[PDB]
């Protein structure tokens, strides 16, 4: 329902948590940031989240985040989802 | 599926029926006695409103159908000062 | 001749309206062009200067509806043996006429009455109830 | 010169003579006369420098002012500061009311004003009688001041000095051949006034001159007023006057015993039982020809007990404290009557005691009967409706079920009382316009609280129908606040005042359910105040939707479904989209903006400021008005 | 999302289609709404013919010009090519 709809076959999902109660933290000070093919609408999600929560930007921590990875280079004997 | 709208000035403004069913008075005019076959003609002669106002209200019909819930960005409807007033004076008789 | 309040003559306009809505409530075929002209005449009657004739038109069509319903009541009560079939025929005719009339009086329905009184379709059904099934209640329920 | 007037007012406030003379010299005559004959405005009250000279006891400075000038004491000023502060009185009235003999005697000795009939028709002798100093009164007698100067309510010196504890002035007037029966507009004698305050010496003084007994406007002899005010010694003196029969004695004793049962200042239940038993014994004194009771059918508020017509009936409830309270209320109703103004207050006190003891049901019944009696007597019941609002709120806050017919009865009482409030505001607009307007505001707020409590209480279908009937009957009267808020506006407004008592926890504004009930009860959603804001205009002013989105969500959809224009324009020409403080209100409004060509054309016409008068229909004139 | 205002004398049709398309289906839909054979009809953009295989995205109007409002005064006429007799809309009255 965007003004300009963005196309993606990459299947975003939302498991954002609350740092005000969750004991999660990231001692790694070197964020690996994000590849371009994932940033199709993550920024647009930040605008979507700021519709009701404009006072906070998406504090991304990736030590617990994961991601499905294909195995097309060898015939895919398995689907090995790994951390981001 | 294509209803005909005749102005007092003789200009016809045939538009899609779904576009023309967003006006309550047109809703009643198409309904009531008879609906013809397929509404191929379904003619109604708006013998009072001017032709430019009928063109503007058909434009608004297209505008409303296109942007009934089209997100939050909606183009501004351009209205000339000389074409206003009488547009709303006829927007009574074409209650939307 | 745009949509200005032209101070229209009530007599000829109300006579034309009377003929057209009589045809409508009797479900007689009526001209589409005359139907749209009657829409224009309703808008002329509900707007014309120096005072709105909407209350006058409302009372006039109230009188028309009540005398038509009473005439149908007299016909049904005269048709003693087939009171039920006649009542069903006149009920179908009057309900279709009431919906079509409420469509015709749409501008008056949502511009003057809403701004006390009841809607023209609601008024038609209420007149049918209070003058057709309210007097002819015991006969209908017994049959 | 108002600065010079304030300066000389300050100089006379300290009782200074030399600085006043230095400030009231080296000038012409007209300005000096204006300075000595005008009022300075301090604290919102205008008073002459003579008033501040007499008030603080500075009699020497005003005496030398009378010596050095010809200033009069006829200057218009207030009466007192004890909750009246009404002007129109003279300066000598304030001097007598100040309570100093020297200033009054010097003001009388130089331009006496002992015959000033003010707007309240009160001479300074009446002010001296209120002070009660016998020297001032006898000095005004020596100056030959009339004593029959009745006040606004036909109140004379005798009644004024007998309502307050001053037996000396009353006695001196009594041997001065005053009015033995000083009737008033209130229907008093000063025996009633003596009984209201228990000045037993003044009662003795009036008895020694045989001041007689009359019936009050509410149907009360002075003995009955003495019994009602819980004052036994006045009952003694008015019973010893021997112009009272067995029935009068019996009813006075019964009323006194009942009045001791319910009064906060003097609540002695043993006195109640003993006086009631003494009354009952004298009822059955003769064995035969007994003055049997005349008990009314039982009142549902006091259980259903029909008083006590037997000595054993009263003996059975000697230690039954709550039953004795109910018997006292029954006896008060029986003798005082349902129309008296004094019968309501002990019922309210007993209800308050029950509420503080969590006897909520009996409290509701008692306050309901008190409300019925006060509405039948046509009294201001804005506070009692408020009390109903808290006791329902505390009932809900303490998780106790509230019966629907009680809310129906209090809502019917609220609707009728708001009707009489509308009548009063239509009638009264100058005397107590602030008081009547504040009562109107409080009545509207209490109605909102009761509706909110109705929403939080589950009821039957017919109970909901009755509540909706009451709300419909109020709404189709269109109540209006100071700023023009409708009843829907106040429920929408988050700035609506909530009482500091138990209504805070339960009655919260804005409440979505209250708006929904008002809307389906027939609220005029399109109505606007004098500012021009609509119901949609104030709901987008809601500051904290993050705490409760559902409250905001279910009223925005409710207002739009009602038919409120999204593009409504106030007096300063702002749409509710422009007044949306938070983003979520803007989003919900945009999802609820049911736009149309009429609205867009109206916006274009209003922006262009083109001519539209006497061309379009008048409904379109209104449409351009609010678009 | 392209819009068009096909004009043939007093007759006027408001049409919605896709920007990336052709005028073949435009001829077919004016055939359907006019109840006349389609080969006689010949669309004109500012009084000039265009190919039946020419895309309407390059006919002279785009999605940012052929808005839901008045897109373009596209003329039409019926062959017995033909003559483009397009009457202008009635002049609005002068503003007071």
UniProtKB/Swiss-Prot annotation, chain B:
GO molecular function, one term: transcription corepressor binding
Cellular component per GO, a single term: Cul2-RING ubiquitin ligase complex
Gene3D superfamilies (alphabetical): Potassium Channel Kv1.1, Chain A
GO BP terms: protein ubiquitination; regulation of transcription by RNA polymerase II; target-directed miRNA degradation; transcription initiation at RNA polymerase II promoter; ubiquitin-dependent protein catabolic process
Pfam families: Skp1_POZ (PF03931)
Cellular localisation: Nucleus
PTM summary: Ubiquitinated by the DCX(AMBRA1) complex, leading to its degradation by the proteasome.
Pathway: Protein modification; protein ubiquitination
Keyword flag Nucleus: yes
Tissues expressing the protein: Overexpressed in prostate cancer cell line PC-3 and breast cancer cell line SK-BR-3.
Top-rank taxon: Eukaryota
SUPFAM superfamilies linked to this entry: POZ domain
Keyword terms of this UniProt record: Host-virus interaction, Nucleus, Transcription, Transcription regulation, Ubl conjugation, Ubl conjugation pathway
Family: Belongs to the SKP1 family.
PANTHER family per the UniProt record, alphabetical: ELONGIN-C
Subunit text: Heterotrimer of an A (ELOA, ELOA2 or ELOA3P), ELOB and ELOC subunit. The elongin BC complex interacts with EPOP; leading to recruit the elongin BC complex to Polycomb group (PcG) target genes, thereby restricting excessive activity of the PRC2/EED-EZH2 complex.
Protein name: Elongin-C
Taxonomic source organism: Homo sapiens (Human)
Gene name of the record: ELOC
From Swiss-Prot, chain C:
Superkingdom to which the source organism belongs: Eukaryota
Subcellular location: Nucleus
Post-translational changes noted in the entry: Neddylated; which enhances the ubiquitination activity of ECS (Elongin BC-CUL2/5-SOCS-box protein) E3 ubiquitin-protein ligase complexes. Neddylation leads to structural rearrangment in the complex that allows interaction between the E2 ubiquitin-conjugating enzyme and the acceptor ubiquitin. CBC(VHL) complex formation seems to promote neddylation. Deneddylated via its interaction with the COP9 signalosome (CSN) complex.
Family in the record: Belongs to the cullin family.
Domain-related comment: The Cullin neddylation domain restrains the RING domain of RBX1 in the E3 ubiquitin-protein ligase complex; this restraint is removed upon neddylation of the cullin.
Function: Core component of multiple cullin-RING-based ECS (ElonginB/C-CUL2/5-SOCS-box protein) E3 ubiquitin-protein ligase complexes, which mediate the ubiquitination of target proteins. CUL2 serves as a rigid scaffold in the complex and may contribute to catalysis through positioning of the substrate and the E2 ubiquitin-conjugating enzyme. The E3 ubiquitin-protein ligase activity of the complex is dependent on the neddylation of the cullin subunit and is inhibited by the association of the deneddylated cullin subunit with TIP120A/CAND1.
The protein's name in its UniProt record: Cullin-2
Biological source species: Homo sapiens (Human)
Swiss-Prot record, chain D:
Chain positions of TPR repeats: 344-377
ANK repeats, residue ranges: 45-74, 87-116, 120-149, 153-182, 186-215, 218-248, 483-527, 531-568
KW Repeat (keyword) present: yes
SUPFAM superfamilies tied to this protein: Ankyrin repeat
Pfam families: Ank (PF00023), Ank_2 (PF12796)
Effect of residue 82 to A: Abolished binding to -Gly-Leu-Asp-Arg C-degron at the C-terminus
Activity modulation: Activity of the CRL2(FEM1B) complex toward FNIP1 is inhibited by BEX family proteins (BEX1, BEX2, BEX3, BEX4 and/or BEX5) in absence of reductive stress. Mechanistically, BEX proteins act as pseudosubstrate inhibitors that associate with FEM1B via zinc in absence of reductive stress, thereby preventing association between FEM1B and FNIP1.
Tissue: Widely expressed. Highly expressed in testis. Weakly expressed in other tissues.
Broad class of where this protein is predominantly found: cytoplasm
Effect on the protein upon substituting residue 597 to A: Abolished ability to promote ubiquitination of target proteins such as GLI1
A Gene Ontology molecular function term of the record: metal ion binding
GO biological process, one term: branching involved in prostate gland morphogenesis
Annotated Zn(2+) binding sites: 186
Residues bound to Zn(2+) 1: 185
Annotated site residue numbers, Cleavage: 342-343
Assigned GO CC terms: Cul2-RING ubiquitin ligase complex; cytoplasm; cytosol; mitochondrion; nucleoplasm; nucleus; ubiquitin ligase complex
SMART domains: ANK
Residues that hold Zn(2+) 2 according to the record: 186, 218
Membrane-spanning parts: none
Localization of this protein: Cytoplasm; Nucleus
InterPro entries to which the protein is assigned, alphabetical: Ankyrin_rpt, Ankyrin_rpt-contain_sf
Domain of life: Eukaryota
Family: Belongs to the fem-1 family.
Protein name as it appears in the record: Protein fem-1 homolog B
Chain's gene name: FEM1B
From Swiss-Prot, chain E:
UniProt keyword list: Acetylation, Host-virus interaction, Nucleus, Phosphoprotein, Transcription, Transcription regulation, Ubl conjugation pathway
Any single Gene Ontology cellular-component annotation: Cul5-RING ubiquitin ligase complex
Single GO MF annotation: transcription corepressor binding
Subcellular location: Nucleus
Functional description taken from the UniProt entry: SIII, also known as elongin, is a general transcription elongation factor that increases the RNA polymerase II transcription elongation past template-encoded arresting sites. Subunit A is transcriptionally active and its transcription activity is strongly enhanced by binding to the dimeric complex of the SIII regulatory subunits B and C (elongin BC complex).
Subunit: Heterotrimer of an A (ELOA, ELOA2 or ELOA3P), ELOB and ELOC subunit. The elongin BC complex interacts with EPOP; leading to recruit the elongin BC complex to Polycomb group (PcG) target genes, thereby restricting excessive activity of the PRC2/EED-EZH2 complex.
Name used for this protein in its record: Elongin-B
Keyword Plastid: no
Pathway annotation from the record: Protein modification; protein ubiquitination
Family: Belongs to the Elongin B family.
Whole sequence portion shown: 2 to 100 of 118
Biological-process GO terms, alphabetical: positive regulation of proteasomal ubiquitin-dependent protein catabolic process; protein ubiquitination; protein-containing complex assembly; target-directed miRNA degradation; transcription elongation by RNA polymerase II; transcription initiation at RNA polymerase II promoter
Keyword Coiled coil: no
Domain Ubiquitin-like: 1-65
